Design a protein around this nucleic acid. Sequence first.
RNA 1: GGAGAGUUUGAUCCUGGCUCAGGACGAACGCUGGCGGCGUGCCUAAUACAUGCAAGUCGAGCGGACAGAUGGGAGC
Length: 158
Amino acid sequence: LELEERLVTVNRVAKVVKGGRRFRFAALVVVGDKNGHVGFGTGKAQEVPEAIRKAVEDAKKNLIEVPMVGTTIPHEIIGRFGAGNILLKPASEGTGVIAGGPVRAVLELAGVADILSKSLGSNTPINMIRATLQGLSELKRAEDVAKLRGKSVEELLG
RNA sequence: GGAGAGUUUGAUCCUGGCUCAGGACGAACGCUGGCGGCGUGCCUAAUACAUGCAAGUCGAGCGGACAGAUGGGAGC
C-alpha cells in the first residue's frame, strides 16, 4: 500500500533524575492510504520515524479496514476508549469531514470525505475514533450482516 | 445535521472549573471619517414642562345679523 503520514502532535516529556530533568519527545502520527486503511502510531517517546514505523504496523493490525459506503461510513457509531468518546455519524454527499483536530487526521487518511463527528472528551483521542471505525466493521456496508443473519442485501436494507 | 483550542504537573492520564475563536444589538465610548440607497433613533424620570401646532365639519336643518345688486327708485 501507498501510505501518507500526518503528524498529530509532538509533546516534550520529562523524567527527573538527581542531575535534573531529562527530556524526550513523544510524537503521535496517523498514517493511511486515503482509501480505507489508517494506522494509530505511538512514537516510542523519541522521534517521528519511530512513530511512523509503529503507525504502519497498526494500520494492518488494528484497523484491518475502515468500512465505507460511498464517501461515508455505513451507520452511526460511538467510539469509546477510556474517557475518549467520539460520535461518528454518516453524512450526505458534499457534507465534508466535519470533525475536530486529531479526529480529522484519522478520517482524512481513512479516505472518509463525508462525516459528522462530535468529540465528547479530548486529549489525543485517536484510540476512541479507532474503536468506532472497527465497530463499523462489526456491521460493515451490509454484506457481512446479511451473510451473518442469513439474508440478502436488499432484503436487509429494503 | 453536530469541528475545537489554551490553562492544575518535573512529566502523566483523569476529574474539574476558567478563558478564547462564532453569531447577535435600539448600543455607548475612543480615534478616524467621502458619497449614495433602504432601515433605525428616550432602553434612564408612566419625571416636570415655556411656546406653537395635533378634530373638526354640514348654509341643500337654522332664525338671524352682515353682505350681494340683476333691476326700478336716487338728490343731482
